[PDB]
Amino acid sequence: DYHKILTAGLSVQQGIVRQRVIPVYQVNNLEEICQLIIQAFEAGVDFQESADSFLLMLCLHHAYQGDYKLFLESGAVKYLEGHGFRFEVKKRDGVKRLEELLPGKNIKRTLAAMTTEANAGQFLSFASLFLPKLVVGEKACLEKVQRQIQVHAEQGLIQYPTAWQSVGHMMVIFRLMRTNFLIKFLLIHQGMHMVAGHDANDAVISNSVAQARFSGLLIVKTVLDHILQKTERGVRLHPLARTAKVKNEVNSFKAALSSLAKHGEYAPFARLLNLSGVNNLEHGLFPQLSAIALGVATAHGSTLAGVNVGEQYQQLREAATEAEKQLQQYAESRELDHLGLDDQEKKILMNFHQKKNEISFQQTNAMVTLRKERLAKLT
Amino acid sequence: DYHKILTAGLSVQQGIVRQRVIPVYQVNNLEEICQLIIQAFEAGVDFQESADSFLLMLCLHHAYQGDYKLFLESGAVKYLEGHGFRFEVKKRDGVKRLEELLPGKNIKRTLAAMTTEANAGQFLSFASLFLPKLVVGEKACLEKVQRQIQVHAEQGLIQYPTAWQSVGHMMVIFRLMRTNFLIKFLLIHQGMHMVAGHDANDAVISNSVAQARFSGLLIVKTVLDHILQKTERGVRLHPLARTAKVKNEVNSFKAALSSLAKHGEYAPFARLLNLSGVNNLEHGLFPQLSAIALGVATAHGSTLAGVNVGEQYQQLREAATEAEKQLQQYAESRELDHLGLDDQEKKILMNFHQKKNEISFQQTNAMVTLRKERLAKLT
RNA sequence: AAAAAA
RNA sequence: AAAAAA
RNA sequence: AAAAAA
């Protein structure tokens, strides 16, 4: 077989090619340490390589109330150990300053050159607000965070310190979330696994994690929801994508999904967690499938019209959207003649469909207009 | 299978990813402690993380009269332990002040800086009045509480202290109910499990819990009562939702229900208890199904017309409501011709249906008018 | 999350 | 060796 | 990477 070469570098056996040792500090005054960590973050301290330990202590305190034995027996740890993480407990008790935990001289002087209004749960749940759209850029991410804060306030669920709502603070949090794997992983793991018993902060994390599913992986939804159509007999390929020119992108896409599947329950977060195989799902690798799948999906989702694509894709996208709207009006019209609708009943449904389509069309246009206005504002 | 990725993060094995240790204080003067707790709540004291212990003592006193052995063998405890709760008994007897139970310096000073008219049963039953509409916002919740108090007074069932009817007090209670899982859980558990022997306070809790079923989960009633129609042969899909455009939302909805089902008897309270999987039932995930299911349901329930939806949904909702009213008039008219109604009997039923529909139409309009007036008042 | 429920 | 790929 | 989601 001569085509196997094309997939040779896509699928490898799991093993460990890296080692990452994280100090786990075991102190009696865990709450005091957590308060110092929050203050250091409010002050804009970059803990660099030591950040994993400080973020871990906030997580350990929040999730296990200092129970280090359970923390290190958790599913999160067992998962991480299989990827080269090593957790070592260091009993550096009696600590009054974070500079006494640090093994990086720049961190030590930043901390040397130093009461807050928050606990670890609030710090972590605030950080989790950045998971949806984390991978869409800092502008989009910050707007999403602001929108969620306003909702949580309206819910009466949680109120964050006003200092944290400043841009300068949110950018510190954004950078920690973009560069620190462990904090993203732990927030996702807890949000996706707690069953009952959530505190206000856990409700926030759980909701934020749910909103991050497939964030940055729209191609996995537009292709699987509209191009590859699963039915009782198998998977049908949508007519606008049955062209030989794009069928190869469809099969290449299936190969990419086959590699993402190795991550199980974390696969929906592959773009946030930079999981292996996510690079096989880039839009540039599937230029016809990307424009077509989004274009047909846009004919159904009136809000999907707000999604931007590059210039290469915009014209094909519109061609696919218009073709899908026409294909569906035909399909809706013929489906009624296979139903036991007599005449009078059928006519009611016809008027419903016409109204439904007009309402959607108007909604779609409104979103297109906003997309253009947003680009004009960025320009 | 390539569509399995879409559900990968929705269903996980139950296990414990958190530990929450709750001190259970064992004192001889349990009634005196309960009175101190009520006074602290009347004073607006925020017990933060210790709130679980104080709320637990009020519950333990009310439900078991101080029998700690039975309390800790209860179904409520066995359930909670499976989610990481740990209950430890601390024999801190001889206590005169709550500051002597507390392990949080802000709580200690608030209590340091300090006779009431109520018992634990009243405190707990008052708090339970906030369960219906707890998740609809503080305005709606407070109005519901006021309406229930007036009813209970008319019933001659229970009279609450006038101080508790102030807004400032009700907001303390609202915040405890919004953020403390354990109190919501315990009120629901008792309300849903007592069979006979209810005191005035238990009658109030039981009624308040019954009214909280599916509070915040209207989508689970409008879809299951009107879109997915169970009959002897299986489940039929309502004509206004047989469009391919929404059939995917219907199947996605079934997947969400499949995850809520893991909670058994507590599933109807998933929005109040923030139970895992409830985030798969959000209206934004099912925009056509949400507007249509509510719209058709509104054609049957004249009071359902008072429910607000966002602007995205309002036009589709009305289109579905009008289509359903027309579909039903046709259905009612034809059904009579399949019944042994001769002529004279059939005509009586026809006039009945016409009157019934006119009465409902007028009632629906009245509710629509109120919905608009309420929005105008909020504006 | 948004309506009714002695 | 020659192009595209958040 | 780009939209919506109490």
CA angle B290, B296, B299 (to 5 degrees): 140
Q: Rounded CA gap, A96 and A105, in Å?
A: 19
Query: DSSP letter string over B57-117?
Result: HHHHHHHHTT-HHHHTTSHHHHHHHTTTEEEEEE---S-SSGGGT---HHHHHHHH----S
> Dihedral sign, CA of B205, B210, B213, B216?
negative
Residues with Cβ within 8 Å of B226's Cβ and at least 6 positions away in sequence, in order, are B238, B293, B296, B297, B300
Whose tokens are 């707790």? That residue is B37
- Alpha carbon separation from B3 to A258, A328, B259 (Å, rounded): 11, 23, 17
Q: DSSP label at B238?
A: P
Q: Do B276 and A302 touch (CB under 8 A)?
A: no
| CB-CB contact of B190 with B202 (8 Å) | yes
Please list every residue in chain B whose beta carbon sits closer than 8 Å to the beta carbon of residue A196: 83, 181, 263, 266, 273-276
Whose tokens are 């694509």? That residue is A309
Q: Rounded CA gap, A127 and A141, in Å?
A: 11
> Dihedral sign, CA of A41, A45, A48, A51?
negative
Which 234-293 residues of chain B touch chain A by CB within 8 A?
A: 239-240, 242-245, 248, 262-263, 266, 273-276, 279-280, 287
| CB-CB contact of B298 with B318 (8 Å) | no
Q: Do B2 and A264 touch (CB under 8 A)?
A: no
Q: Rounded CA gap, B20 and B84, in Å?
A: 6
Give the count of Cβ contacts less than 8 A between chain A and B.
Answer: 153
Of A263, A283, A257, A258, which is closest to residue A275 (Cα–Cα)?
A263
Amino acid present at B366: A
Please list every residue in chain B whose beta carbon sits closer than 8 Å to the beta carbon of residue A235: 2-3
Q: How many CB atoms lie within 10 A of CB B358?
A: 10
Closest nucleotide over all strands to B306 (CA to C1') = C3
Residues with Cβ within 8 Å of A23's Cβ and at least 6 positions away in sequence, in order, are A50, A53, A88, A90, A101, A103
Rg (CA), chain B: 25
Rg (CA), chain A: 25
Q: Rounded CA gap, B60 and B54, in Å?
A: 10
CA A182 from centre of chain: 15
Q: Rounded CA gap, B300 and A230, in Å?
A: 34
Of A17, A12, A23, A44, which is closest to residue A182 (Cα–Cα)?
A23
- Alpha carbon separation from A287 to A10, A154, B115 (Å, rounded): 20, 42, 75
Q: Rounded CA gap, B329 and B324, in Å?
A: 9
Residues with Cβ within 8 Å of B227's Cβ and at least 6 positions away in sequence, in order, are B237, B238, B241, B250, B289, B292, B293, B296
CA angle B169, B108, B125 (to 5 degrees): 30
Of B221, B122, B321, B254, which is closest to residue A356 (Cα–Cα)?
B321
Strand spans (E) along A134-237: 228-231, 234-237
Q: Rounded CA gap, A243 and A71, in Å?
A: 53
Q: Rounded CA gap, A274 and A179, in Å?
A: 11
Q: Rounded CA gap, B16 and A376, in Å?
A: 49
Of B329, B322, B318, which is closest to residue B356 (Cα–Cα)?
B329
| CB-CB contact of B243 with A353 (8 Å) | yes
How many alpha carbons fall within 13 Å on the CB side of residue A79? 14
Strand spans (E) along B134-245: 228-231, 234-237
Q: DSSP label at B225?
A: I
- Alpha carbon separation from B12 to A73, A275, B277 (Å, rounded): 18, 19, 10
Closest residue to B2, CB basis, from A67, A257, A348: A257
- Alpha carbon separation from B59 to A17, B20, B182, B304 (Å, rounded): 54, 18, 10, 36
| Optimal mutation site among A79, A195, A204, interface B, most CBs of chain B within 10 A | A195
- A94 burial level (CB within 10 Å; 0-12, 13-18, 19+): exposed
Strand C–CB B216 distance below 7 A = yes
| CB-CB contact of A271 with A278 (8 Å) | yes
Shortest distance between the Cα of A108 and any Cα of chain B, in A, equals: 29
Please list every residue in chain B whose beta carbon sits closer than 8 Å to the beta carbon of residue A206: 274, 276, 279
Q: Which two tokens stand for residue B279?
A: 């985030």
Residues with Cβ within 8 Å of B303's Cβ and at least 6 positions away in sequence, in order, are B363, B367
Strand E–CB A153 distance below 7 A = no
Experimental method: cryo-EM
Q: Which two tokens stand for residue B296?
A: 């058709």
Q: Do A196 and B266 touch (CB under 8 A)?
A: yes
What spatial distance separates the first Cα and last Cα of chain B, rounded to whole Å?
A: 50
User: Strand D: which of residues 197-216 in chain A lie with Cβ below 7 A?
Assistant: 216
Shortest distance between the Cα of B62 and any Cα of chain A, in A, equals: 22
Distance of C1' in C5 from CA in B211, Å: 8
- Alpha carbon separation from B247 to B3, B254, B288, B341 (Å, rounded): 16, 11, 10, 38
Q: Which two tokens stand for residue B145?
A: 């509480």
SS3 content of chain A, % helix, strand, coil (to 5): 65, 5, 30
Q: Which two tokens stand for residue B181?
A: 């899982």
Of B208, B53, B58, B190, which is closest to residue B129 (Cα–Cα)?
B208
Q: Rounded CA gap, B377 and B379, in Å?
A: 5
**Length in residues, chain B:** 379
Closest nucleotide over all strands to B219 (CA to C1') = C1
Whose tokens are 């856990």? That residue is A202
Look at residue A251 and give its three-state secondary structure.
Answer: helix
Q: Which residues pair with B88 in a beta bridge?
A: B23
